[PDB]
Amino acid sequence: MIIVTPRYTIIEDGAINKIEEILKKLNLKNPLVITGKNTKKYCRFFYDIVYYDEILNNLEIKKYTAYDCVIGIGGGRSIDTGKYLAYKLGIPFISVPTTASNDGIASPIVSIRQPSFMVDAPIAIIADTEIIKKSPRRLLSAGMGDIVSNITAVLDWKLAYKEKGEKYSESSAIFSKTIAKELISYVLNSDLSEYHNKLVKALVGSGIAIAIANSSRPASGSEHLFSHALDKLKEEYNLNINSLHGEQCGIGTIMMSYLHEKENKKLSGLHEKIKMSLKKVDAPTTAKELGFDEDIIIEALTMAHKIRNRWTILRDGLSREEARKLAEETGVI
Amino acid sequence: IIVTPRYTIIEDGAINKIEEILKKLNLKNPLVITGKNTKKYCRFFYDIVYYDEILNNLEIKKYTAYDCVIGIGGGRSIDTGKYLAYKLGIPFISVPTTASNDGIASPIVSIRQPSFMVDAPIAIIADTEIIKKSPRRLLSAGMGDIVSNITAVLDWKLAYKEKGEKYSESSAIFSKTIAKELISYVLNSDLSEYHNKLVKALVGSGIAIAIANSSRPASGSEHLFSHALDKLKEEYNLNINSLHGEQCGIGTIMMSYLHEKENKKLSGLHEKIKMSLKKVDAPTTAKELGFDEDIIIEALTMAHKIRNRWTILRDGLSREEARKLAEETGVI
Ligand SMILES: NC(=O)C1=CN([C@@H]2O[C@H](COP(=O)(O)OP(=O)(O)OC[C@H]3O[C@@H](n4cnc5c(N)ncnc54)[C@H](OP(=O)(O)O)[C@@H]3O)[C@@H](O)[C@H]2O)C=CC1
Ligand SMILES: NC(=O)C1=CN([C@@H]2O[C@H](COP(=O)(O)OP(=O)(O)OC[C@H]3O[C@@H](n4cnc5c(N)ncnc54)[C@H](OP(=O)(O)O)[C@@H]3O)[C@@H](O)[C@H]2O)C=CC1
Ligand SMILES: O=P(O)(O)OC[C@@H](O)CO
Ligand SMILES: [K+]
Ligand SMILES: [K+]
Ligand SMILES: [Zn+2]
Ligand SMILES: [Zn+2]
């Protein structure tokens, strides 16, 4: 058991102004900032700044040997790139999200390219809820999709334990699952005035659960496989579809939950509750809303189990006919 | 602000990873705080000091030269190192040589009651080969500190419901589940990995505290009871070397029984906790713990006053109620 977690986590209005304080506490002096064109406006300091584009191709091409840490400011891509870069340089990474679209905020996962892999958790998470509150609404709605995914991820994890003796941690699993349930329950019971705040807390919690389990298992299962398959097909067929990771995972969750329901009647109705929670925050729940033809959904379903060697409710895979029935019966198509 | 450990290592030989960890944290000159019985595990060049020597004097900065503190040993070594680090404004590394309580990774300092919050240790380095060999009584005491999470979380939920205290379901259930898994392991195995599963549980419990920013998920009425016992030991000058965990275990037995009375859903909880303690040879009675029945009773009646923290004890037990409770649960 060797586990790397964040040292500092700040979630509050104006948190972006604590960067200096946090750097000082960690005895860090020379960061490189990674950001995006749309998020550069929040980089209010004098550190060196670089856009994640102009790293992601040149890639490996000591230009960076002077920096003692990396600060990722922005969306999932900014953070993911900064995280990867920090790993390559052997230095600490500070995560400064400007939205709440995915759990990459505090996770040890780097997802530049599939397959994903593990690195250190960010040494600090500085989440300015004033900035995040104003981020495009669609991104906040997408975060719900990433959170509900923990439910099917955990069901899949238990399943792999039972059927394949995969290493399993009950306390990590229930932590992850409960994070999602807290948020669902908040979404279904409230006026949503603190949604952004509770969402960020959930995404961060989800990152910590990953760190603690030393695996993306508590946060990524078949629903994520489905989303990754969608991604492969967008690239393959050159679809120009602006769907987000969280949105895809949310829809995946709906379907995968339903598969677990078939085998365990105690869970019956789970998928509908999830669906409701997604609709309540305006996340998409159908292929049409997400921007996909029904055939892409189906194909993604049939290929999802092959995306990674990770046992899930999909087992050895869905037939085309099964996939269609599933998507039909859950209202996705 | 939430402060958690950065690094956590739990494995055989972990004590040899001190330097690796110091290097990762860019740290070079620690002050080591240890005990006379644990000094033998201090195999390195660093300055060493015993926790007595510090605890006498306190305020009197001969320490300017150190860039961190490493606590090596039992709960007291760790607690003192933790406190000292806080006072010096430098990071603390926790190196437990046994598994006797959840101070290992917690943000709590407990040198004087009442206890208070500081930073969680920056690193936890838990050598399960050393811990495995620690006195068995200490390992048994750890079980007492873990089962406490069950009543702590029940008390937390109760305070939420009856007083609108701030509550976090996902922290609570994490804490609770840590305890449930260990109980279920203790009741269902040959115990060959007890020390390991115990240390993981104790560390998890520390993390839950940090995440909740409160000792709520790990400390409730059972702890109030243990603190009361401590007050009485000092007051009556009793010479009784009961451990914190042992006291908390026995507290949990009783407090879980109080919760059971109000909620049928929990039937057999108290019994199962008791069984689990017996299975690892933790004490479950006053006699075993070394206390006269009147001390137990007095501790029960004063426990709700130990801190301003609502529990199943509510506004307090009468002497009569306390005696019944202790009787009914087999404590006396
Ligand atoms: N590591 C992990 O575990 C995970 C990582 N990921 C990674 O994250 C990516 C998904 O992240 P996601 O956020 O969904 O997508 P993007 O990172 O592509 O972000 C979407 C867009 O929103 C913009 N944006 C973000 N915040 C604000 C703000 N406050 N104001 C205005 N615009 C804003 C970004 O701007 P800009 O263009 O300036 O960046 C970006 O253009 C994936 O491609 C993958 O790389 C995804 C899931 C999990
Ligand atoms: N703040 C927190 O989170 C909490 C802190 N605590 C702290 O912990 C204390 C209780 O800790 P606890 O460990 O129960 O009691 P002690 O620290 O008194 O430890 C008991 C004894 O065990 C010895 N010891 C420890 N490990 C070994 C080993 N491997 N081999 C031989 N001897 C060993 C210690 O030796 P030595 O004499 O050399 O130290 C000590 O003599 C409290 O007084 C409090 O300060 C307790 C609960 C919660
Ligand atoms: O392991 P993957 O599927 O990238 O997921 C981890 C991350 O996306 C959070 O859920
Ligand atoms: K997730
Ligand atoms: K405890
Ligand atoms: Zn994800
Ligand atoms: Zn305790």
CSV table of C-alpha atoms in Angstrom, one decimal, chain A:
chain,number,residue,atom,x,y,z
A,1,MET,CA,0.0,0.0,0.0
A,2,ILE,CA,1.7,3.2,-1.4
A,3,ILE,CA,-0.7,6.1,-1.7
A,4,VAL,CA,-0.3,9.7,-2.9
A,5,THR,CA,-3.0,12.2,-2.0
A,6,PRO,CA,-3.3,16.0,-2.2
A,7,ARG,CA,-1.8,17.9,0.6
A,8,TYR,CA,-4.0,21.0,0.3
A,9,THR,CA,-7.5,21.3,-0.9
A,10,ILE,CA,-9.4,24.7,-1.0
A,11,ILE,CA,-12.9,25.0,-2.3
A,12,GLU,CA,-14.3,28.5,-1.8
A,13,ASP,CA,-15.1,31.8,-3.4
A,14,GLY,CA,-11.9,33.7,-4.4
A,15,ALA,CA,-9.7,30.6,-3.9
A,16,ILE,CA,-7.6,31.5,-6.9
A,17,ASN,CA,-6.0,34.3,-4.8
A,18,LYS,CA,-4.5,31.7,-2.5
A,19,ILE,CA,-2.0,30.3,-5.0
A,20,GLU,CA,0.9,32.3,-3.5
A,21,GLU,CA,0.0,31.3,0.0
A,22,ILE,CA,-0.1,27.6,-1.0
A,23,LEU,CA,3.1,27.8,-3.0
A,24,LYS,CA,4.8,29.3,0.0
A,25,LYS,CA,3.5,26.6,2.3
A,26,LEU,CA,4.8,24.0,0.0
A,27,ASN,CA,8.2,25.8,-0.4
A,28,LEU,CA,7.7,26.1,-4.1
A,29,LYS,CA,9.1,29.1,-6.0
A,30,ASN,CA,9.0,28.8,-9.7
A,31,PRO,CA,5.9,27.4,-11.4
A,32,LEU,CA,5.1,26.9,-15.0
A,33,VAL,CA,1.4,27.6,-15.7
A,34,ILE,CA,-0.5,25.6,-18.2
A,35,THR,CA,-3.8,27.1,-19.5
A,36,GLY,CA,-6.2,27.4,-22.4
A,37,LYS,CA,-7.1,30.4,-24.7
A,38,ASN,CA,-10.6,30.7,-23.1
A,39,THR,CA,-9.2,30.4,-19.5
A,40,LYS,CA,-6.1,32.5,-19.8
A,41,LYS,CA,-8.2,35.5,-18.5
A,42,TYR,CA,-8.1,33.9,-15.0
A,43,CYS,CA,-4.3,33.7,-14.8
A,44,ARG,CA,-3.8,36.8,-12.8
A,45,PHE,CA,-0.2,36.6,-11.9
A,46,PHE,CA,3.3,36.9,-13.4
A,47,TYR,CA,4.3,33.3,-13.7
A,48,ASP,CA,5.3,31.9,-17.1
A,49,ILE,CA,2.3,30.7,-19.0
A,50,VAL,CA,2.0,28.2,-21.8
A,51,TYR,CA,-1.1,26.9,-23.7
A,52,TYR,CA,-1.8,23.2,-23.7
A,53,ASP,CA,-1.9,23.0,-27.5
A,54,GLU,CA,1.6,24.1,-28.0
A,55,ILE,CA,2.7,21.2,-25.7
A,56,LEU,CA,0.5,18.4,-26.9
A,57,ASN,CA,2.2,17.9,-30.3
A,58,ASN,CA,5.8,19.0,-30.0
A,59,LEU,CA,5.4,17.0,-26.9
A,60,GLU,CA,8.7,15.5,-25.7
A,61,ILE,CA,10.6,18.3,-27.5
A,62,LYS,CA,14.7,20.5,-21.0
A,63,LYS,CA,13.0,23.6,-22.2
A,64,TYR,CA,11.4,23.2,-18.7
A,65,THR,CA,14.2,22.2,-16.4
A,66,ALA,CA,14.1,25.4,-14.3
A,67,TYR,CA,10.5,25.0,-13.0
A,68,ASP,CA,9.9,23.5,-9.6
A,69,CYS,CA,6.2,22.8,-10.2
A,70,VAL,CA,3.4,23.0,-12.7
A,71,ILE,CA,0.1,24.8,-12.2
A,72,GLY,CA,-2.8,23.7,-14.3
A,73,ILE,CA,-5.5,26.4,-14.7
A,74,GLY,CA,-8.7,25.8,-16.6
A,75,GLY,CA,-10.7,23.0,-17.9
A,76,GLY,CA,-10.1,19.2,-18.0
A,77,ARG,CA,-7.5,19.5,-20.8
A,78,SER,CA,-5.4,22.2,-19.1
A,79,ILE,CA,-5.3,20.2,-16.0
A,80,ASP,CA,-4.6,16.9,-17.7
A,81,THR,CA,-1.8,18.3,-19.7
A,82,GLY,CA,-0.2,20.1,-16.7
A,83,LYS,CA,-0.5,16.9,-14.7
A,84,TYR,CA,1.2,14.9,-17.5
A,85,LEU,CA,3.9,17.5,-17.9
A,86,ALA,CA,4.6,17.6,-14.1
A,87,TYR,CA,5.0,13.8,-14.1
A,88,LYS,CA,7.5,13.9,-17.0
A,89,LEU,CA,9.5,16.7,-15.2
A,90,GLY,CA,9.3,14.9,-11.8
A,91,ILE,CA,7.8,17.9,-10.1
A,92,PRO,CA,4.6,18.6,-8.1
A,93,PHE,CA,1.3,19.6,-9.9
A,94,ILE,CA,-1.2,22.1,-8.6
A,95,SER,CA,-4.7,21.9,-9.9
A,96,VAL,CA,-6.7,25.1,-10.4
A,97,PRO,CA,-10.0,24.2,-12.1
A,98,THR,CA,-12.1,26.9,-13.7
A,99,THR,CA,-15.0,24.6,-14.1
A,100,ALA,CA,-16.4,21.4,-12.7
A,101,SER,CA,-16.8,19.1,-15.7
A,102,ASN,CA,-14.9,16.0,-14.6
A,103,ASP,CA,-13.0,14.4,-11.8
A,104,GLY,CA,-9.6,14.9,-13.3
A,105,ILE,CA,-9.5,17.9,-11.0
A,106,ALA,CA,-8.0,15.9,-8.1
A,107,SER,CA,-7.4,12.5,-9.5
A,108,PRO,CA,-4.1,10.8,-10.1
A,109,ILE,CA,-5.2,9.9,-13.6
A,110,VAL,CA,-3.7,11.2,-16.8
A,111,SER,CA,-6.1,10.9,-19.8
A,112,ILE,CA,-4.3,12.7,-22.6
A,113,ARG,CA,-4.6,9.6,-24.7
A,114,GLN,CA,-6.3,6.3,-23.9
A,115,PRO,CA,-5.3,4.2,-22.3
A,116,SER,CA,-5.3,6.3,-19.2
A,117,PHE,CA,-2.6,5.9,-16.6
A,118,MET,CA,-1.8,6.7,-13.0
A,119,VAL,CA,0.5,9.4,-11.7
A,120,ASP,CA,0.6,11.3,-8.4
A,121,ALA,CA,-2.4,13.1,-7.2
A,122,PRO,CA,-2.1,16.9,-7.4
A,123,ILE,CA,-0.3,18.2,-4.4
A,124,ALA,CA,-2.9,20.9,-4.2
A,125,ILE,CA,-6.4,21.6,-5.4
A,126,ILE,CA,-7.5,25.2,-5.5
A,127,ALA,CA,-11.0,25.4,-6.6
A,128,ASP,CA,-12.5,28.9,-6.8
A,129,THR,CA,-16.2,28.4,-6.7
A,130,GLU,CA,-16.8,32.0,-7.8
A,131,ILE,CA,-15.1,31.3,-11.1
A,132,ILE,CA,-16.6,27.8,-11.5
A,133,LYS,CA,-20.1,29.2,-10.8
A,134,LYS,CA,-19.8,31.4,-13.9
A,135,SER,CA,-18.4,28.7,-16.2
A,136,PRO,CA,-20.5,27.6,-19.1
A,137,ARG,CA,-23.6,25.8,-17.8
A,138,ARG,CA,-23.1,22.8,-20.0
A,139,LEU,CA,-19.8,22.0,-18.3
A,140,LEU,CA,-21.4,22.0,-14.9
A,141,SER,CA,-24.2,19.8,-16.2
A,142,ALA,CA,-21.6,17.4,-17.6
A,143,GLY,CA,-19.9,17.1,-14.1
A,144,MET,CA,-23.1,15.4,-12.9
A,145,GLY,CA,-22.6,12.7,-15.6
A,146,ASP,CA,-19.0,12.1,-14.4
A,147,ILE,CA,-20.3,11.8,-10.7
A,148,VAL,CA,-23.2,9.4,-11.3
A,149,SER,CA,-20.7,7.2,-13.1
A,150,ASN,CA,-19.3,6.2,-9.7
A,151,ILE,CA,-22.4,4.2,-9.1
A,152,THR,CA,-21.9,1.9,-12.0
A,153,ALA,CA,-18.2,1.9,-11.6
A,154,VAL,CA,-18.6,0.6,-8.1
A,155,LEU,CA,-21.2,-2.0,-9.1
A,156,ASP,CA,-18.7,-3.1,-11.8
A,157,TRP,CA,-15.9,-3.2,-9.3
A,158,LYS,CA,-17.9,-5.5,-7.0
A,159,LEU,CA,-18.8,-7.6,-9.9
A,160,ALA,CA,-15.1,-8.0,-11.0
A,161,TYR,CA,-14.3,-8.9,-7.4
A,162,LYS,CA,-17.0,-11.6,-7.2
A,163,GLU,CA,-16.4,-13.1,-10.7
A,164,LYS,CA,-12.6,-12.5,-11.2
A,165,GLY,CA,-11.1,-12.0,-7.7
A,166,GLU,CA,-10.0,-8.5,-8.7
A,167,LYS,CA,-8.6,-6.5,-5.8
A,168,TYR,CA,-11.4,-4.7,-4.0
A,169,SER,CA,-11.8,-2.2,-1.2
A,170,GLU,CA,-15.2,-1.9,0.4
A,171,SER,CA,-14.6,1.3,2.2
A,172,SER,CA,-13.2,3.1,-0.9
A,173,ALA,CA,-16.1,1.7,-3.0
A,174,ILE,CA,-18.8,2.8,-0.6
A,175,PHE,CA,-17.1,6.3,-0.2
A,176,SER,CA,-17.2,6.7,-3.9
A,177,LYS,CA,-20.8,5.4,-4.3
A,178,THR,CA,-22.0,7.6,-1.4
A,179,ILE,CA,-20.4,10.7,-2.9
A,180,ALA,CA,-22.6,10.2,-5.9
A,181,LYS,CA,-25.7,9.4,-3.9
A,182,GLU,CA,-25.3,12.6,-1.7
A,183,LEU,CA,-25.2,14.7,-4.8
A,184,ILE,CA,-28.1,12.9,-6.5
A,185,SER,CA,-30.1,13.4,-3.4
A,186,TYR,CA,-29.1,17.1,-3.2
A,187,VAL,CA,-30.0,17.5,-6.9
A,188,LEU,CA,-33.4,16.0,-6.5
A,189,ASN,CA,-34.3,17.8,-3.2
A,190,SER,CA,-33.0,21.4,-3.5
A,191,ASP,CA,-33.3,24.6,-5.4
A,192,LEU,CA,-29.8,23.9,-6.7
A,193,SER,CA,-28.4,27.2,-5.5
A,194,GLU,CA,-25.3,25.4,-4.2
A,195,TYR,CA,-25.0,22.8,-7.0
A,196,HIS,CA,-21.7,24.1,-8.3
A,197,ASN,CA,-20.2,24.0,-4.9
A,198,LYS,CA,-21.5,20.5,-4.0
A,199,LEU,CA,-20.5,19.3,-7.5
A,200,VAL,CA,-16.9,20.4,-7.0
A,201,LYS,CA,-16.8,18.8,-3.6
A,202,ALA,CA,-18.1,15.6,-5.1
A,203,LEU,CA,-15.5,15.7,-8.0
A,204,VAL,CA,-12.7,16.2,-5.6
A,205,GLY,CA,-14.0,13.4,-3.3
A,206,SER,CA,-14.0,11.2,-6.3
A,207,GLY,CA,-10.4,12.0,-7.0
A,208,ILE,CA,-9.4,11.2,-3.5
A,209,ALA,CA,-11.2,7.8,-3.7
A,210,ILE,CA,-9.2,7.0,-6.8
A,211,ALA,CA,-6.0,7.9,-5.0
A,212,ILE,CA,-6.9,5.8,-2.0
A,213,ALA,CA,-7.9,2.8,-4.1
A,214,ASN,CA,-4.8,3.2,-6.2
A,215,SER,CA,-7.1,2.6,-9.1
A,216,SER,CA,-9.7,4.4,-11.2
A,217,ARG,CA,-12.1,1.5,-10.3
A,218,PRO,CA,-14.3,3.5,-7.9
A,219,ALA,CA,-14.9,6.2,-10.6
A,220,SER,CA,-14.6,4.4,-13.9
A,221,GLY,CA,-16.4,1.3,-15.1
A,222,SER,CA,-18.4,0.2,-18.1
A,223,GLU,CA,-20.0,3.6,-18.4
A,224,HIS,CA,-16.6,5.2,-19.0
A,225,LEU,CA,-15.7,2.4,-21.5
A,226,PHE,CA,-18.8,3.4,-23.4
A,227,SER,CA,-17.8,7.0,-23.4
A,228,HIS,CA,-14.2,6.1,-24.5
A,229,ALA,CA,-15.8,4.0,-27.3
A,230,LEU,CA,-17.8,7.0,-28.4
A,231,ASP,CA,-14.6,9.0,-28.5
A,232,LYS,CA,-12.9,6.4,-30.7
A,233,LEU,CA,-15.8,6.5,-33.1
A,234,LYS,CA,-15.8,10.4,-33.3
A,235,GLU,CA,-12.2,10.2,-34.3
A,236,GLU,CA,-12.7,7.3,-36.7
A,237,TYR,CA,-15.7,8.6,-38.6
A,238,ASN,CA,-14.5,12.2,-38.2
A,239,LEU,CA,-17.7,13.2,-36.6
A,240,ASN,CA,-18.0,16.9,-35.7
A,241,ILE,CA,-19.8,16.4,-32.4
A,242,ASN,CA,-19.1,18.6,-29.5
A,243,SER,CA,-20.2,16.2,-26.8
A,244,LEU,CA,-18.4,16.3,-23.5
A,245,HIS,CA,-16.9,13.4,-21.5
A,246,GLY,CA,-19.3,13.8,-18.6
A,247,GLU,CA,-22.3,13.9,-20.8
A,248,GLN,CA,-21.3,10.7,-22.5
A,249,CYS,CA,-20.5,9.0,-19.1
A,250,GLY,CA,-23.9,10.1,-17.7
A,251,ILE,CA,-25.8,8.4,-20.6
A,252,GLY,CA,-23.5,5.4,-20.2
A,253,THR,CA,-24.4,5.2,-16.6
A,254,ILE,CA,-28.1,5.2,-17.3
A,255,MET,CA,-27.6,2.1,-19.6
A,256,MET,CA,-25.1,0.3,-17.5
A,257,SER,CA,-27.2,0.7,-14.4
A,258,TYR,CA,-30.0,-1.0,-16.2
A,259,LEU,CA,-27.8,-3.9,-17.1
A,260,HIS,CA,-27.0,-4.4,-13.4
A,261,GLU,CA,-30.7,-4.1,-12.6
A,262,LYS,CA,-31.5,-7.2,-14.8
A,263,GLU,CA,-29.3,-9.3,-12.6
A,264,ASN,CA,-30.2,-7.8,-9.2
A,265,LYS,CA,-33.8,-6.8,-8.7
A,266,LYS,CA,-32.9,-4.9,-5.4
A,267,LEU,CA,-31.4,-2.2,-7.7
A,268,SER,CA,-34.5,-2.0,-9.8
A,269,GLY,CA,-35.3,1.6,-10.7
A,270,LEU,CA,-31.8,2.9,-10.1
A,271,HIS,CA,-31.3,3.9,-13.7
A,272,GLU,CA,-34.5,6.0,-13.6
A,273,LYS,CA,-33.4,7.9,-10.5
A,274,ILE,CA,-30.0,8.6,-12.2
A,275,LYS,CA,-31.8,9.7,-15.3
A,276,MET,CA,-34.0,12.0,-13.3
A,277,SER,CA,-31.0,13.6,-11.6
A,278,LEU,CA,-29.3,14.2,-14.9
A,279,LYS,CA,-32.5,15.8,-16.3
A,280,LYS,CA,-32.8,18.0,-13.3
A,281,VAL,CA,-29.4,19.7,-14.0
A,282,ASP,CA,-30.0,19.7,-17.7
A,283,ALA,CA,-27.5,17.0,-18.6
A,284,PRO,CA,-28.4,15.1,-21.7
A,285,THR,CA,-30.1,11.7,-21.3
A,286,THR,CA,-30.7,10.7,-25.0
A,287,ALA,CA,-28.6,10.2,-28.1
A,288,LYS,CA,-30.5,12.9,-29.9
A,289,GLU,CA,-29.7,15.4,-27.1
A,290,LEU,CA,-26.0,14.3,-27.0
A,291,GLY,CA,-25.8,14.8,-30.8
A,292,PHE,CA,-25.3,11.1,-32.0
A,293,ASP,CA,-27.1,8.9,-34.5
A,294,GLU,CA,-28.5,5.7,-32.9
A,295,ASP,CA,-26.1,3.5,-34.9
A,296,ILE,CA,-23.1,5.2,-33.2
A,297,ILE,CA,-24.5,4.5,-29.8
A,298,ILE,CA,-25.1,0.9,-30.6
A,299,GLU,CA,-21.7,0.4,-32.1
A,300,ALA,CA,-20.1,2.1,-29.1
A,301,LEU,CA,-22.1,-0.3,-26.8
A,302,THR,CA,-20.8,-3.4,-28.7
A,303,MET,CA,-17.2,-2.2,-28.6
A,304,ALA,CA,-17.0,-0.9,-25.1
A,305,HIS,CA,-15.9,-4.0,-23.3
A,306,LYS,CA,-12.8,-4.1,-25.6
A,307,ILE,CA,-11.7,-0.6,-24.7
A,308,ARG,CA,-9.8,-1.8,-21.8
A,309,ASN,CA,-9.0,-5.1,-20.0
A,310,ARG,CA,-11.4,-4.4,-17.1
A,311,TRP,CA,-14.2,-6.7,-16.3
A,312,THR,CA,-17.6,-5.1,-16.1
A,313,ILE,CA,-21.3,-5.9,-16.4
A,314,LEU,CA,-20.7,-5.9,-20.2
A,315,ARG,CA,-18.6,-9.1,-19.6
A,316,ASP,CA,-17.5,-10.5,-23.0
A,317,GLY,CA,-19.7,-8.0,-24.9
A,318,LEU,CA,-23.1,-7.0,-26.2
A,319,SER,CA,-24.4,-8.1,-29.5
A,320,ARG,CA,-25.8,-5.5,-31.8
A,321,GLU,CA,-29.3,-6.7,-31.0
A,322,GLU,CA,-28.7,-6.6,-27.2
A,323,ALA,CA,-27.2,-3.1,-27.5
A,324,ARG,CA,-30.2,-1.8,-29.4
A,325,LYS,CA,-32.7,-3.3,-26.9
A,326,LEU,CA,-30.7,-1.7,-24.0
A,327,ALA,CA,-30.6,1.7,-25.6
A,328,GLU,CA,-34.3,1.4,-26.5
A,329,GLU,CA,-35.4,0.1,-23.1
A,330,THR,CA,-33.6,3.0,-21.3
A,331,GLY,CA,-34.9,5.7,-23.6
A,332,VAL,CA,-31.5,6.6,-24.9
A,333,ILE,CA,-32.8,5.9,-28.4
